[PDB]
């Protein structure tokens, strides 16, 4: 049906992009400061993925003022073909690297909390060092079709030089939509669907082990572990503390079930990673859903009024998805105690001198 050229929504979206740049440069730079200053054997298993996540966000945040200009100029790129190629490449590099850093953080919690294989093969620091190298190789290779296909051209008969994906090089005469639906679906799959499913499965197994809560005796100090149980007292290994018959007492001091305290493990790392995934899911979900509904709209012959709704909601969907870059340093300020303590350490000593 009828389709007009993409126009500017207002001054709201370009102003947010400038704010995300300002908060993202200083914010992610403060994250990279705290991790690299604390070297030696003091580094956490999660720190390697946090530092790379800060690198991915920082490099993309610098390209946002160029995109803020593009939005307000009603989608017209005045920075040339080279900057269009580099700016668009760093969007998808960030998209893949940030999603792979989150899976890395989630899998690091899986290997630590669940422990499927013995500590000999486990090698948490080695596995983290290998996966961080692979994710940077994967993100750079998966974002390469964006580096090649992007050019500054006059899309349709509209007098505007815009930064777009040119399929005239790879696609034939009719298979123009095939390459957009091909590279578009795979981008959402390897950049959001597959990563988010790994994060959720990792959390399901982590929750499965945490569910078996240990109980400590307040009288002597005996810790009942559901994994070990008490086979001598007629309690099979695997049985939960609540499932234990009421006649059972402490095998070391002989006190009833009422004198046992439930232990709530101080899992700080899990809390930091959970909030990072939750925010990422809330920021990236609308962008990927609207784009998929746009693909599955022209193919399934969806009503014309629905395509108009997706087009007007999309600039706001990309906006909040880009806010995610400057969102993490604020999340570490409210949930990560080690980041909080390291920032305050350079506050009293650094400024004084």
């Amino acid at each position: 049906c009828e389709y007009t050229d993409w126009k500017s929504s207002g001054a709201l979206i370009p102003a947010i992009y400038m704010l995300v740049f300002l908060l993202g440069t200083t914010g992610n730079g403060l994250v990279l400061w705290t991790v690299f200053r604390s070297s030696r054997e003091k580094r956490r298993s999660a720190d390697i993925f946090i530092a790379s996540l800060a690198v991915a966000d920082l490099t993309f945040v610098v390209t946002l003022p160029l995109w803020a200009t593009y939005t307000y100029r009603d989608y017209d790129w005045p920075f040339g073909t080279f900057f269009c190629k580099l700016s668009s490449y760093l969007i998808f590099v960030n998209m893949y690297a940030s999603a792979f850093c989150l899976t890395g953080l989630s899998f690091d919690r899986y290997l630590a909390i669940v422990r499927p294989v013995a500590n000999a093969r486990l090698r948490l620091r080695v596995s983290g060092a290998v996966a961080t190298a692979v994710l940077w190789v994967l993100a750079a290779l998966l974002a390469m079709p964006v580096m090649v296909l992007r050019t500054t051209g006059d899309l349709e008969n509209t007098n505007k030089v815009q930064c777009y994906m040119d399929y005239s090089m790879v696609a034939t005469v009719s298979s123009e939509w095939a390459w957009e639906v091909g590279l578009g679906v795979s981008s959402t799959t390897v950049g959001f669907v597959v990563p988010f499913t790994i994060m959720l499965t990792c959390y399901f197994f982590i929750a499965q082990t945490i569910a078996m809560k240990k109980y400590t005796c307040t009288v002597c100090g005996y810790i009942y572990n559901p994994e070990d149980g008490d086979p001598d007292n007629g309690v099979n290994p695997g049985t939960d503390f609540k499932d234990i018959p009421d006649d059972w007492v402490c095998p070391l001091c002989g006190v009833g079930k009422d004198q046992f305290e439930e232990v709530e493990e101080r899992r700080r790392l899990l809390s930091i990673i959970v909030v990072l995934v939750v925010t990422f899911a809330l920021c990236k979900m609308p962008y990927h859903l609207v784009k998929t509904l746009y693909m599955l709209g022209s193919l399934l012959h969806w009503p014309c009024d629905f395509d108009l709704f997706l087009m007007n909601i999309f600039p706001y969907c990309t906006c909040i998805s880009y806010v995610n870059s400057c969102l993490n340093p604020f999340l570490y300020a409210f949930f990560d105690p080690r980041f909080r303590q390291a920032c305050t350490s350079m506050l009293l000593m650094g400024q004084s001198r």
Partner: peptide, 17 residues
């Protein structure tokens, strides 16, 4: 330089992001 333009009809364009 930069200049604001009136809407023009066209084909289904792929999302600009």
């Amino acid at each position: 330089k930069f200049r604001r333009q009136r809407p023009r009809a066209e084909h289904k364009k792929x999302l600009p992001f």
